[PDB]
C-alpha cells in the first residue's frame, strides 16, 4: 500500500507545479470560440432545406 | 315513426357505439406507440380491434338506419345491410384466430415463434378478412329475398324496381342467416373455440402440475368469461333467426329481437377489456 501511495504523491507533485490561468480569462476564450463559429453551426442557426443534405 | 321500445334500442346502440369506438381505437393506438407489441398475437388482437372499431362506427349506424326503416330501393337496402354482415363476421373470425393463436402458444411452445411469424400472422389476418367479405357479400351474390318481393311487387301492380321499407328481414333471406351464416360461420367458430379453450386449459393445468390452484382458477375464470361473452352475444340473435325460419307460425315479440341485436353489437364493446386488457404489456402501455 505504501508503494502505490508514493506513486500517487509524484503525480500530484507534477500537477502542483503547473501554470494555471484565471477563470475570467478561461471563460472569455470559450465564449470567443462560440461567437466566432456561430454561423458555421447548423444545429445552432439552422440552414435552409436545400442546403441541408438529409431533407432537401 | 319509431315505437316505444324502438327508442330504447337506439339509445342502447349508441351507448354501445360510444363505448366501442374509443376502447378499440385505444388498442390500435397502443399497438402503434409500442414496438414490443409487434408479435403475432398482437397482430391478431389489433385485427380484432380493427374489426370491432368498424363494428362500433359502421355497423351501429347502419343497424339503426335499418331498424328505423326508410322507404328505399332494394339494392340500396342491400348495400346498407351487407356491411353489417361483413364487419360482424370479421369480429367472429378474429376471435377464432386469437383462440388458434393461444392454442399454438401452449401446444407447441418452444417452436412457436419459428412457426407463427408475423408474416404468417398477416396472411392469416388477410384470410379471415377475405372470408368475412365472402360471407357478407353472399347476399349480393344472388342469395336474397329479391324473387319473393318482386312477385309481391308484380302482384301489387307496380312496374319496375321494387321499393320497400328497408328492414333486415325484408332483404336478407332467413335461409342465408340460418343455413349459411349461423350453421357454417358462427356456430363452428363457437364450437371450435370451446374445443380449443378446453384443450388450452388441459395443457395449462398439465404444465402447472409438473399458489398454483389460484393461478389455475384465474385461468379457468378468464377462459370461461371469454366463451360466455361470445355465447351471450351471438347465440340469442341466431336462435331467434332459427325460430323465425323453422317455426313461421310461431310468435315472438319485437322487444326480444331488439335485445338480441344489441347483444351481438355489444360483443365489440367488451372485447378490449377481456382480450387486450388482460395482457400486462397492454396495461403498461395504457397508463403511459
Amino acid at each position: 500500500s505504501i508503494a502505490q501511495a508514493r506513486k500517487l504523491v509524484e503525480q500530484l507533485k507534477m500537477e502542483a507545479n503547473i501554470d494555471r490561468i484565471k477563470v475570467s480569462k478561461a471563460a472569455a476564450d470559450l465564449m470567443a470560440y462560440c461567437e466566432a463559429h456561430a454561423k458555421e453551426d447548423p444545429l445552432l442557426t439552422p440552414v435552409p432545406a436545400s442546403e441541408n443534405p438529409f431533407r432537401e | 315513426s319509431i315505437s316505444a321500445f324502438q327508442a330504447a334500442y337506439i339509445g342502447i346502440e349508441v351507448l354501445i357505439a360510444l363505448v366501442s369506438v374509443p376502447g378499440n381505437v385505444l388498442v390500435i393506438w397502443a399497438v402503434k406507440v409500442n414496438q414490443a407489441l409487434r408479435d403475432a398475437t398482437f397482430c391478431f388482437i389489433v385485427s380484432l380491434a380493427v374489426a370491432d372499431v368498424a363494428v362500433g362506427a359502421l355497423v351501429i349506424p347502419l343497424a339503426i338506419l335499418i331498424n328505423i326503416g326508410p322507404q328505399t330501393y332494394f339494392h340500396t337496402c342491400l348495400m346498407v345491410a351487407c356491411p353489417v354482415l361483413i364487419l360482424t363476421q370479421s369480429s367472429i373470425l378474429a376471435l377464432l384466430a386469437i383462440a388458434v393463436d393461444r392454442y399454438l402458444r401452449v401446444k407447441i411452445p418452444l417452436r412457436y415463434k419459428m412457426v407463427v411469424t408475423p408474416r404468417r400472422a398477416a396472411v392469416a389476418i388477410a384470410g379471415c378478412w377475405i372470408l368475412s367479405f365472402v360471407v357478407g357479400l353472399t347476399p349480393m351474390f344472388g342469395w336474397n329475398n329479391l324473387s319473393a318481393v318482386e312477385r309481391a311487387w308484380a302482384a301489387n301492380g307496380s312496374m319496375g324496381e321494387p321499393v320497400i321499407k328497408c328492414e333486415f328481414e325484408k332483404v336478407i333471406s332467413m335461409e342465408y342467416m340460418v343455413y349459411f351464416n349461423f350453421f357454417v360461420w358462427v356456430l363452428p367458430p363457437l364450437l371450435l373455440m370451446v374445443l380449443i379453450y378446453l384443450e388450452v386449459f388441459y395443457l395449462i393445468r398439465k404444465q402447472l402440475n409438473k399458489k398454483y390452484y389460484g393461478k389455475e382458477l384465474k385461468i379457468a375464470k378468464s377462459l370461461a368469461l371469454i366463451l360466455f361473452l361470445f355465447a351471450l352475444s351471438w347465440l340469442p340473435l341466431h336462435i331467434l333467426n332459427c325460430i323465425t325460419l323453422f317455426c313461421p307460425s310461431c310468435h315472438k315479440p319485437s322487444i326480444l329481437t331488439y335485445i338480441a341485436i344489441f347483444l351481438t353489437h355489444g360483443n365489440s364493446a367488451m372485447n378490449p377489456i377481456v382480450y387486450a386488457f388482460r395482457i400486462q404489456k397492454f396495461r403498461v402501455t395504457f397508463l403511459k
Binding site: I2, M14, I18, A27, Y33, D41, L43, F54 | -
Partner: protein, 334 residues
C-alpha cells in the same frame, strides 16, 4: 503509510486553494449578457432500422455521411445515413459489445466489449478481422482512433492503453484511475485525451509522455461519458448523479454544472455541437436534453425513443446529431 497520506492531504489542500485563487468569476455571470439560444425543436430526419437488440455505441465517420453502430445482436452495421442504405453488416465474434469507433481514414472500424478484446476490421479488403488487440483484463468500454495505425482504448480494469495495431502491442499504458474507466475522448489535435471513471474523477492524459497531467473531480458518482469542447481547451462530463459539468484544462477546475431538479436519471452520453454552444446529453429517462453550454439553461428536448439513450454523436461538419437507443433504433436529428 502514515506520513504519505498526511503529505498527500497537504497537496490536496494546496490544489484547492490554487483552483479557487484563479476563480475570479463564474462562467454564468460572465455570460449573462449574451442572447439565449432559445427553444430548439429538432425533428427526426431518419430512423435507422435493422438492429434487433439494444444499441450500445455509435460513431460518425469523418466524412459526416457514414456511421457505424454496435448492438448486442452481434452485428456491427455501417449505415449510409443520407440514403438509409446499409453499407456493411459486420458479424461479431462476441456479441457483448460496448463500444465502436470509425477510423478517420474510413479504412477501419473497431469494436469490443465484455470479451476484453478490441477487434479491428479492415473495410477496404468482404470485411474481415485484421487484428484482435488483447491484453486488457476488464471489459473494453471505449476506443478511439488517433489514426489508422494507432488506437487508444479504455477498459474496466481501471487502465487506458495506446495500441500499435500493426504490431499488436500496448505501446503506452495509462494507469492511475482507481475505478472502472467508462469513456474517453480524443482532443482535436490527438495529442491529449481525457478519460472518465467510476471513481467520479476525470483525468487528462498526454499520449506521447504517457502519464496524467491533470485530474478533475467534482462529480458525486460514476462518470459514464466525456467529450472535448471543440477547441480542445475544455471538456464536459456526464454522470449518474443527473448532472453534466464543464471542466476547463487551463483553469484546472469546473466551470459550470448542467442539471434540472426534475431530471433525476443517469446520463449515458454527451457531445458538443460544432461551435461548442450546444451541449447535447443522453439520459436514462429515454430523452436527450440539449443544454446551452454557456448559460446552463436547458434549450430543448429530443424525445423520440422508447428506451434508454445509450449513445449519441454530432457530425464533424456539425450538420446532424445521431441518437442511438436500447429500443434498437437510431435516429438522425437536425
Amino acid at each position: 503509510l502514515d506520513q504519505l497520506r498526511q503529505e498527500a492531504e497537504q497537496l490536496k489542500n494546496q490544489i484547492r486553494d490554487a483552483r479557487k485563487a484563479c476563480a475570479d468569476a463564474t462562467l454564468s455571470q460572465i455570460t449573462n449578457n449574451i442572447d439565449p439560444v432559445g427553444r430548439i425543436q429538432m425533428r427526426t430526419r431518419r430512423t435507422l432500422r435493422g438492429h434487433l437488440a439494444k444499441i450500445y455505441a455509435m460513431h460518425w465517420g469523418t466524412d459526416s455521411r457514414l456511421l457505424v453502430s454496435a448492438s448486442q445482436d452481434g452485428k456491427l452495421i455501417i449505415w449510409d445515413s443520407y440514403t438509409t442504405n446499409k453499407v456493411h453488416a459486420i458479424p461479431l465474434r462476441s456479441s457483448w459489445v460496448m463500444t465502436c469507433a470509425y477510423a478517420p481514414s474510413g479504412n477501419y472500424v473497431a469494436c469490443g466489449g465484455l470479451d476484453n478484446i478490441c477487434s479491428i476490421y479492415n473495410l477496404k479488403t468482404n470485411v474481415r478481422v485484421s487484428r484482435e488487440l488483447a491484453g486488457h483484463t476488464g471489459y473494453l468500454s471505449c476506443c478511439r482512433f488517433l489514426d489508422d495505425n494507432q488506437i487508444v482504448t479504455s477498459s474496466g480494469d481501471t487502465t487506458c492503453a495506446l495500441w500499435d495495431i500493426e504490431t499488436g502491442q500496448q505501446t503506452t499504458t495509462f494507469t492511475g484511475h482507481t475505478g472502472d474507466v467508462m469513456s474517453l475522448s480524443l482532443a482535436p489535435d490527438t495529442r491529449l485525451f481525457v478519460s472518465g471513471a467510476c471513481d467520479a474523477s476525470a483525468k487528462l492524459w498526454d499520449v506521447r509522455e504517457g502519464m496524467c497531467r491533470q485530474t478533475f473531480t467534482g462529480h458525486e458518482s460514476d462518470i459514464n461519458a466525456i467529450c472535448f469542447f471543440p477547441n480542445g481547451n475544455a471538456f464536459a462530463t456526464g454522470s449518474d448523479d443527473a448532472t453534466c459539468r464543464l471542466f476547463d484544462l487551463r483553469a484546472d477546475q469546473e466551470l459550470m454544472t448542467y442539471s434540472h431538479d426534475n431530471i433525476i436519471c443517469g446520463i449515458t452520453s454527451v457531445s458538443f455541437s460544432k461551435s461548442g454552444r450546444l451541449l447535447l446529453a443522453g439520459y436514462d429517462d429515454f430523452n436527450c436534453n440539449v443544454w446551452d453550454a454557456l448559460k446552463a439553461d436547458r434549450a430543448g428536448v429530443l424525445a423520440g425513443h422508447d428506451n434508454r439513450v445509450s449513445c449519441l454523436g454530432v457530425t464533424d461538419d456539425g450538420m446532424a446529431v445521431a441518437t442511438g437507443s436500447w429500443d434498437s433504433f437510431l435516429k438522425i436529428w437536425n
